[PDB]
């Protein structure tokens, strides 16, 4: 049997195979008609983020989300149409000789851009993502399919609407098929198994989706090569050593970490601080730490302003591990290729995480640092060699 | 939801994830009581055994495999309880330590051996495999999921129950937890899609399955990186250098090749003959194009005797494709990591295929070759790094 997020991801692929072949001119030329469809039926959109915003204010919407939401503040629509041009308007990224190397006469060997594959794009609260990734995929001769969060149902309807309409309505003239582009109007999170098919994520929002995403998929993800690495901080850590390995791994970065900390480990709370007001480093706490923490500092009076705000680049995640067998469930919950850590003066829990742990590489008392949207990321690489009957058996 | 397949793999990743902790002494006692269970059992599995061989006599069974089913010809059962034996008394194959270098004062990198995590074992028509599998599974600390073919379901069957039944009966003794190993009795295919959980297949039987299995999945399969590697012979393939070429594709190896076969090429007969009798290559044919070549070479009088046996190291199939539209659907099947050859005089057929294929490296008139069970494969690495407190900003 074939799931719905199976045929989506498998007709992604077909339609790609079809658009890496598509001439320039006709990748490019459905790019203006779609500025076109999209200019000529701007009211229709106003209206549609208008009732999203309005949504958005009435229920729990955070006013740094609401303004990514108002595709209309400013000249926010216009700079998007614009970026459509700018894209339609480049050099054709695929076909492009990067390097050319001369094998033997008549033996040539070169290297060829060419597509990624199909995209899975996820993004929360930003409509003009819609335009921007369906512009980029077309003209980089990629398949899209594309995800919204909640909060711009509206505004993804009516774009979708017209994306897909204007890609039907010019198949005939542009050769570019339907399915090029797939925008899910929530009809699932089983398209992150679907790595036969997808062969590039592209998160668009928050360090938590990324995390979560990361967490959830086999399917490499843009910008993130790396799982969520861990530190923990055992009941006998100690103090001095627990507050420079953790440091270091801020002073050194884009990664994703979590701390986990054992509450029986005594000064904990000096660690984040320490994070804090000497690496500057935000600290994305889970509510029932934060909750302790900020109560150590409020009994002790040094819970500053700078603490505050502080406390909710590099992301750094922290929360409670009361075990060592607990930091090991944890460790082992995150997707591979991470490293993980732990602080300790005891050796039976040293060796009993080393053993433990699902981990590329492991540390225990030292520092994980120790391990060594444009068209960017969207190309890949395929090789030619062009020879004249030449085999693998010469003198 | 979670599928059946699904529950499968993750219970086999929590599994493994306490079988890597357990002791030499206990991973091996279980080795011990399975071989005592098995020997003292050896009636009951013979019986099931029995029944198989007259189930598949008759059926259409071929005598090779026939031979592979009968568990108790000869010492065949003797040598496969010796074999569990001969495991349990190995070294411990996890925790040795490979490589030790002291990067710093009191800061020292090692690599250790460690379990590769989870294993899919998917066999045809060899009863023994169980035994082995079983017993190097949870010797080397890894989880097992084994899935037979239909000729042994009633030996397969006897043999999971005792197996099944004592590591249930022996779980406190040992350590070693219910499900280190799942002896799956056709409950799917759905399995090779569980690359978040499963980290090797083990396949055990033919190459159509080898095939197979590289087509349906994106985890690693042991002893087979690359995917299938194509040749096109198109229409206005020259018929020199498609010898040379396609011959060159054997005489370089343990590889997968599918030889695409343009009807509409003058003497394509003379390629196959040529790899079979310069070669000494085995052509896995197509029904369709084995009644095709057959019919030209007794129409010639050259239907030798060398060719009949050798028409049906490395591997070879061949099939026809009847445009270069068509060789492109049928390389763009292939799981990713595969290299493709055009040979053809035709340019515009040679860009078609090159912009149209998915593939890392893509040769036109040059041989693809250009491009540069025991415990062996079941062993990964860990690196370890021990410091005293050392973080990445040395001087
Ligand atoms: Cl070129
Ligand atoms: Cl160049
Ligand atoms: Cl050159
Ligand atoms: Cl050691
Ligand atoms: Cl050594
Ligand atoms: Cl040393």
Known sequence: ????????????????????????????????????????????????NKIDLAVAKETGLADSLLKRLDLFKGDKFEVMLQGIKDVAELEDPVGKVKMARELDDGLTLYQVTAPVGVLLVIFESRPEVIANITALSIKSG???????????????????????????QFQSETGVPV?????????????????????????????????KIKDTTKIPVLGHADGICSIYLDEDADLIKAKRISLDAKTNCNAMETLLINPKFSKWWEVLENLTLEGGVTIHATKDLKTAYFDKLNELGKLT??????????????????????????????????????????????????????????????????????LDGLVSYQYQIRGDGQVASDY
């Open 142 to 168: 990629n398949a899209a399919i594309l995800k919204g969060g909640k909060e711009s149902v509206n505004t993804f309807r009516e774009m979708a609407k017209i994306v897909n309409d204007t890609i039907a």
């Open 1 to 48: 049997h074939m799931s719905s997020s199976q045929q989506i991801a498998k007709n992604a692929r077909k339609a790609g195979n079809i658009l890496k072949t598509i001439s320039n001119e006709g990748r490019s030329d459905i790019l203006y008609k779609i500025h076109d469809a999209l200019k000529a039926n701007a009211h229709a959109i106003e209206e549609a």
């Open 305 to 374: 302003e700078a603490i505050q705000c502080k406390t909710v680049s590099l992301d750094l995640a922290a929360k409670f591990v009361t075990s060592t067998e607990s930091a090991i469930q944890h460790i082992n919950t995150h997707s591979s290729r991470h490293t993980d850590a732990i602080v300790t003066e005891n050796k039976a829990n040293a060796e009993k995480f080393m053993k433990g742990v699902d981990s590329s590489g492991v540390y225990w008392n030292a520092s994980t640092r120790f391990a060594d949207v444009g």
């Open 179 to 211: 399915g090029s582009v797939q925008l899910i109007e929530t009809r699932v999170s089983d398209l992150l198994d679907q790595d036969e098919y997808i062969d590039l994520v592209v998160p668009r929002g928050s360090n938590a989706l990324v995390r």
